[PDB]
Amino acid sequence: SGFRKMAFPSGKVEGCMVQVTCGTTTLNGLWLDDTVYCPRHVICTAEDMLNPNYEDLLIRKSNHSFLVQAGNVQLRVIGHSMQNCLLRLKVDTSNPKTPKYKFVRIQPGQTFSVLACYNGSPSGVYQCAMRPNHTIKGSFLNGSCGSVGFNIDYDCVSFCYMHHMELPTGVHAGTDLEGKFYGPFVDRQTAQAAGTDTTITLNVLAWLYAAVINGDRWFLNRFTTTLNDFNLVAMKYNYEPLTQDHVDILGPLSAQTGIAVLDMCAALKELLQNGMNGRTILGSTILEDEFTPFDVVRQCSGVTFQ
Amino acid sequence: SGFRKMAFPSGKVEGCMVQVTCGTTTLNGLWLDDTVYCPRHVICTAEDMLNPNYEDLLIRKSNHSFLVQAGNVQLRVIGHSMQNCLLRLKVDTSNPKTPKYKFVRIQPGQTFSVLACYNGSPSGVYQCAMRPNHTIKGSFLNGSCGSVGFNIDYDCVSFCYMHHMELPTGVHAGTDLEGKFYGPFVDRQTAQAAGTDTTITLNVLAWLYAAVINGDRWFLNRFTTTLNDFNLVAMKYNYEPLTQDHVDILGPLSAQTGIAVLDMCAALKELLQNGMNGRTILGSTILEDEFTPFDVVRQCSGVTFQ
Ligand SMILES: Cc1ccc(S)c(S)c1
Ligand SMILES: Cc1ccc(S)c(S)c1
Ligand SMILES: [Zn+2]
Ligand SMILES: [Zn+2]
């Protein structure tokens, strides 16, 4: 039946994207009710970025220093304030397309959909995982700042990421919708770099369960393992240590497949020590760590192929 | 800067999805202007599928044998006809969310975005390539029939696929929006199976160009090759033969990177004969064939890293 990295339908978010311009800088903003949220560096010039003092740069702006464009309409700013690394612009109009929503700060290992945008116009959508090192391997070009990440539950959009910068290795960093950065990054020019990363163990296990639900059992084995013995192998292969909380989370998947979590860990240990011998799992030649246990339950059938 | 399999924003299509029920069968339909399009097998029962005569099964239905639900509203059918493998239901209301659109029959190797839907409610979006063997490796569960594939240019939605069935190997088959199947498949129960497939050479080359644009040149070499000598290697590795039309298509990418097409073919030939030696390209350990030259130009920077 297939297994794909799928994103949430993006319509509810497309209706919230606008363009924000201050001086010569234009980037994207998120328009919810009567507020537009955007990266605070929209107020900076290239030189400002070397050592910007945002409090000082901002007090020098007025409400009209900001130009907000929604589609083909101009929104009038009637207030502004800084909240951590974001600017909150109050506008004269409430977005009629505002969806039911909330702001959530996602945890490392969790996934979300990104709606890449330029000049307030959505251009593409794809799924990303927040890495343990607090970066995401997105696809972004100049002008994408302010693009957002989100999940959708029922008809409530949980916004969890706003894009702010690209690091030397080509990976990306940003904030939650309260403007607090994920990771130790800052919105200014420094020698900052992505720290060391690690494979998301819980997700790789979830994905092996997805492969079984979809009818594949070739990588299973007759062994079991202790959490501690598993972690000795995990440390060697740069996998996050597995905890009992992670084992508990895998409970439902374990029950749907009849495969005990620690027995699946034994299967993983063997895959790490012996490789995959030219075989594939769910079409992949490598162990995938960008699907959470939740993503698997969402996409896979509730009935294992058996 | 990253490279992801990204789909087109799905909003314009979400506003067109509805549910169509005939008897005990419910699947998805596409509502454009005053017409709803859906798989004709919605009129069949399980037994009907063994050897259905659609002309005979359909003449036995009336306009009211069909229930069309848009969100929470019931649409009244005032006409119906069969067009190849689809049903075209005329309804009493014109969709106010109808986007500018057109129906296109995509060619093998080309890509499109799929909006997976159930009960007329969009659940996810992902990018697929139409394989040379006319199937797509989608992610679909029971109830997904009628889900559509599309591309978006400017603000015109080009619909190119409607989902109808899953084959024994777990891959998927469907039709264009005139109801003609892609491939030799039929909407009934038979021993039909996906034919042999092949790697999409032109796309793998496009992707190697994307990797160079993004700053990576490790797999290049000092050799060149003739189209014929390249094809002898392609035949051995089950790659589609490269033609001069394919070489011409790669012209712009070749110019942006300063790498002659046949020299890039020499690089591919070497990658196929020697493997990738534990290295990755654009984060991948394998040669990717699901990005067209058009997808690359769309997502990559217009300035090579150099
Ligand atoms: C050069 C440059 C211009 C605009 C933005 S928003 C950034 S992050 C960098
Ligand atoms: C069992 C079954 C029920 C409904 C549809 S639309 C199909 S394709 C198969
Ligand atoms: Zn920026
Ligand atoms: Zn069906």
Swiss-Prot record, chains A, B:
Instruction: Tell me what reaction this enzyme catalyses.
Output: TSAVLQ-|-SGFRK-NH2 and SGVTFQ-|-GKFKK the two peptides corresponding to the two self-cleavage sites of the SARS 3C-like proteinase are the two most reactive peptide substrates. The enzyme exhibits a strong preference for substrates containing Gln at P1 position and Leu at P2 position
List the active site: 41, 145
Subcellular location per UniProt equals: Host cytoplasm; Host Golgi apparatus
Q: Which stretches face the Cytoplasmic side?
A: 1-306
Q: Where is the Peptidase C30 domain?
A: 1-306
Quaternary state and interactors: Monomer. Homodimer. Only the homodimer shows catalytic activity.
Q: What does this protein do?
A: Cleaves the C-terminus of replicase polyprotein at 11 sites. Recognizes substrates containing the core sequence [ILMVF]-Q-|-[SGACN]. May cleave human NLRP1 in lung epithelial cells, thereby activating the NLRP1 inflammasome pathway. Also able to bind an ADP-ribose-1''-phosphate (ADRP). May cleave host ATP6V1G1 thereby modifying host vacuoles intracellular pH.
> Can you say what this protein is called?
3C-like proteinase nsp5
**What organism is this sequence from?**
Severe acute respiratory syndrome coronavirus (SARS-CoV)
Taxonomic path: Viruses, Riboviria, Orthornavirae, Pisuviricota, Pisoniviricetes
Q: What gene codes for this chain?
A: rep
Entire-sequence positions represented here = 3241 to 3546 of 7073
